PDB file of C-alpha atoms in Angstrom:
ATOM      1  CA  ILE A   1     105.013  97.340 101.630  1.00  0.00           C
ATOM      2  CA  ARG A   2     105.590  99.939 104.390  1.00  0.00           C
ATOM      3  CA  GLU A   3     107.810 101.881 101.885  1.00  0.00           C
ATOM      4  CA  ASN A   4     104.844 102.211  99.530  1.00  0.00           C
ATOM      5  CA  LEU A   5     102.612 103.856 102.232  1.00  0.00           C
ATOM      6  CA  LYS A   6     105.575 105.723 103.607  1.00  0.00           C
ATOM      7  CA  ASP A   7     105.763 107.449 100.103  1.00  0.00           C
ATOM      8  CA  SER A   8     102.017 108.418 100.352  1.00  0.00           C
ATOM      9  CA  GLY A   9     102.855 110.201 103.534  1.00  0.00           C
ATOM     10  CA  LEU A  10      99.290 109.259 104.871  1.00  0.00           C
ATOM     11  CA  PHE A  11     101.048 106.923 107.172  1.00  0.00           C
TER      12      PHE A  11
END
């Protein structure tokens, strides 16, 4: 899921 958070940019 790291790619989903990576998109948020909050991680």
